[PDB]
Nucleic acid binder design. Structure first.
Ligand SMILES: [K+]
Ligand SMILES: [K+]
Ligand SMILES: [Mg+2]
Ligand SMILES: [Mg+2]
Ligand code: NA
Ligand code: NA
Ligand code: NA
Lengths: 141, 88, 198, 129, 85
RNA sequence: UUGAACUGUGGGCCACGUAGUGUGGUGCCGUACCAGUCCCGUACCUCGACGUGUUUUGACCCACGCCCUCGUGGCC
RNA sequence: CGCGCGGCUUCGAAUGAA
RNA sequence: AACCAUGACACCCAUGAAUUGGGGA
């Protein structure tokens, strides 16, 4: 079940059993790392980088060729984002809701949904502090 | 080697019961829907031989409507039903 | 004479006949083959072993090399084992890497520190992929019979059945020799739906 | 959520035996599940089973033969001393002539008849008869 | 109809209908294909579903259109499926 | 208060007891079947392998002494 | 426009993705 | 009688016709 709702969804991706590259690929490991580094220089998130390679370059499951996950590649080159991307995207949504509520005070439904989002932020930030991905004494607001 | 045996060799159990060949379960004495079917063997000629193969169906399998499905598998294993049509 | 450069420096004092022949054929292969001329000079062999049995009339020659060259030989395998078979009749040629195995410690705190590539399971599977490199494993099963026996079945693609079926009885012997583990093989047309070709 | 994969697997097996099936599929399986199964197979209570491998927790296909009457996990895993074997038998078994209580000791997972012979003790896991 | 079906080796008929992640061993549903736009001499590899935008390297023209589900190619271009491995 | 999976539970010979599978070959009776002959009909009769089921190989397990640098190396 | 040659100096090892 | 007078999370479990939303052939 969803953690903050009543939906029972199952849409997801199923990964292949065979992890070896498909032998029609070319595009050696060095070229893939170059393409990842070029894209991150344009401000694309780790999730958007995997999409661009998948849809236009034939690279599915970047880990399977070059053996390294996308975030690890960016950390090594020193271009990782300051805060994790899931936390950043939750914070952006809560900011837009709050800007809307300042003009629409009677929107009691968006007030209920804002409580759920901020409960998600406080649960996530507690985790990133325990595994030292965020500075201690980091506070949302 | 059926039933319970003493420290001596005497078998003290009375009325060792029947075990259904489909479900491997004891057929009790108050189960009135349990049946027995006898199927005759035949010679290379079309005349019946005089020996019968016998089958046991539990009895609750009949009321569930699964009695027919079990008989097909039992007769196939016993070698009385040809599973699939032969090649041309 | 330069032909021992392909052999490792330790073995250069007392090379065996099989190792000396392998070194010589590699050296002439260095300047002859057009694409093997590159990516060959950096390579050098570790050792040579031979396995033969009363059954499986052909002979098996195992060639071990340093693990640091594994990406160098994957770009030149298939063709390499072809010409080695051409030069040496009556044998099939396998190319393996050498891997260290770390035993399982008895302390939880040391267990969390063991390297993962050095564990027994990981090494054995990389051995199997080395035995059949151009192909790959598409399935794996473990059967536990009514007695204590346990079997391990590995399935391969059926698209390459013609080019690989010959070496199967021998390769199972090589795997047991190196890792003391027994494996059976099978084929799967349409691996996606688990359709076992008979 | 799913808190015990041993309680799950033993519930699937006893369920399929109640209906009358011939095979079951069990997920997600683990080392403790396999060692529990081998104890039932060695005493001649299930039959051949096989493990299908995905690059995750696997699945298990178990063949039945109509001999199992019940199997279940005990939760939480209480503690049993070598003098405490009888008390458990009197509680969760139909008779002392047949049945098994599976324990986990430092020698390994094994039933209570073998554990008494080696004169050990440990935490109970389940039972079957 | 007299066949006995086991769970370890399912038949082709019953397996072809199952949802992915509901099979015996889960796996992908997608694939890759070489797409040749009219002219431009270039061959591009395009994902079957490809929610993003795709432009040919040479002519800088869009090749596929996003869609809930499979992507649809522009009218001129014709594709060719690639083997799984 | 309760919490998913994973790092691993050897290999040979002993020796014969035992032991199921399948494996090959062995004889291959008796019947069936296969290919043949007479030859219907529009059924049969004659003649030369294929399948049982007698034995006998390969692994599995149970009874079991030793050895193993008890994965590979690298020594000897 | 590409194209190899000569001297050349300069500075990828991580369990898996419920 | 804020009622399904039926607390939340997870597993297994026989059939035949319908219906709302997305996807594949
Ligand atoms: K919820
Ligand atoms: K709806
Ligand atoms: Mg746990
Ligand atoms: Mg996940
Ligand atoms: Na909650
Ligand atoms: Na009401
Ligand atoms: Na109430």
């Amino acid at each position: 079940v969803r953690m903050h709702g009543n939906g029972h969804g199952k849409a997801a991706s199923a990964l292949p059993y065979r992890r070896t590259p498909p032998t029609w690929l070319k595009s050696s490991s060095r070229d893939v790392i170059d393409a990842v580094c070029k894209l991150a220089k344009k401000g694309l998130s780790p999730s958007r980088i995997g999409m661009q390679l998948r849809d236009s370059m034939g690279i599915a499951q970047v880990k399977n060729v070059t053996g390294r996950k996308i975030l690890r590649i960016l950390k090594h080159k020193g271009m990782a984002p300051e805060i994790p991307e899931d936390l950043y995207c939750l914070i952006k949504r809560a900011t837009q809701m709050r800007k809307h509520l300042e003009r629409n005070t009677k929107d009691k439904d968006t007030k209920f949904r804002l409580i759920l989002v901020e409960s998600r932020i406080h649960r996530l930030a507690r985790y990133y502090r325990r595994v030292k991905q965020l500075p201690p004494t980091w506070k949302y607001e | 080697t059926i039933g319970t045996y003493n420290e001596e060799g005497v078998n003290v159990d009375l009325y060792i019961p029947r075990k259904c060949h489909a479900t491997n379960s004891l057929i009790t004495s108050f189960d009135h829907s349990a049946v027995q079917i006898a199927i005759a063997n035949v010679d290379p000629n079309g005349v019946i031989d005089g020996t019968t193969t016998t089958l046991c169906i539990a009895g609750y399998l009949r009321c569930q409507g699964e009695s027919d499905h079990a008989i097909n598998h039992l007769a196939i294993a016993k070698g009385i039903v040809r599973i699939k049509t032969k090649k041309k | 004479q330069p032909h021992l450069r392909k052999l490792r420096k330790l073995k250069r004092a007392n090379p065996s006949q099989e190792e000396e022949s392998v070194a010589r054929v590699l050296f002439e292969l260095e300047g002859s083959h057009k694409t093997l001329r590159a990516q060959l000079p950096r390579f050098h062999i570790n050792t040579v072993r031979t396995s033969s049995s009363p059954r499986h009339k052909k002979t098996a020659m195992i060639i071990l090399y340093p693990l640091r060259f594994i990406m160098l030989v994957r770009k030149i395998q298939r063709t390499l084992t072809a010409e080695l078979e051409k030069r040496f009749p009556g044998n099939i040629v396998v190319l393996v890497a050498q891997r260290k195995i770390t035993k399982r410690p008895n302390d939880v705190y040391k267990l969390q520190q063991v390297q993962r590539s050095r564990t027994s399971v990981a090494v054995f599977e990389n051995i199997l992929n080395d035995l059949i490199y151009p192909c790959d494993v598409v399935g794996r099963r473990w059967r536990y019979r009514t007695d204590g026996s346990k079997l391990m079945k590995v399935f391969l693609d059926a698209r390459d059945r013609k080019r690989v079926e010959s070496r199967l009885p021998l390769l199972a012997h090589v795997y047991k020799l190196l890792t003391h583990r027994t494996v059976t093989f099978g084929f799967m047309w349409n691996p996606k739906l688990q359709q076992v070709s008979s | 959520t799913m808190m015990s994969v041993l309680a799950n697997a033993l519930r699937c097996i006893a369920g399929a035996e109640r209906r009358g099936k011939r095979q079951v599929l069990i997920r997600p399986s683990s080392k403790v599940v396999v060692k529990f199964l081998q104890v039932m197979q060695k005493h001649g209570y299930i039959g051949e089973f096989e493990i299908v491998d995905d690059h995750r927790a696997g699945k298990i296909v178990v063949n039945l033969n109509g001999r199992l009457n019940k199997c279940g996990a005990i939760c939480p895993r209480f503690d049993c001393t070598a003098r405490d074997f009888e008390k458990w038998v009197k509680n969760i078994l139909p008779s002392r002539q047949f049945g098994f209580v599976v324990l986990t000791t430092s020698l390994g997972i094994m039933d209570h008849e073998e554990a008494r012979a080696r004169n050990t003790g440990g935490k109970v896991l389940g039972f079957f008869y | 109809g007299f066949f006995d079906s086991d769970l370890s080796y399912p038949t082709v008929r019953t397996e072809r209908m199952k949802h992915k992640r509901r099979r015996l061993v889960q796996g992908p549903n997608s694939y890759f294909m070489d797409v040749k736009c009219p002219g431009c001499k270039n061959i591009t590899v395009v994902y079957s579903h490809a929610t993003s935008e795709v432009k040919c390297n040479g002519c800088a023209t869009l090749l596929c259109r996003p869609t809930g589900g499979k992507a649809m190619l522009v009218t001129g271009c014709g594709f060719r499926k690639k083997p799984d491995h």
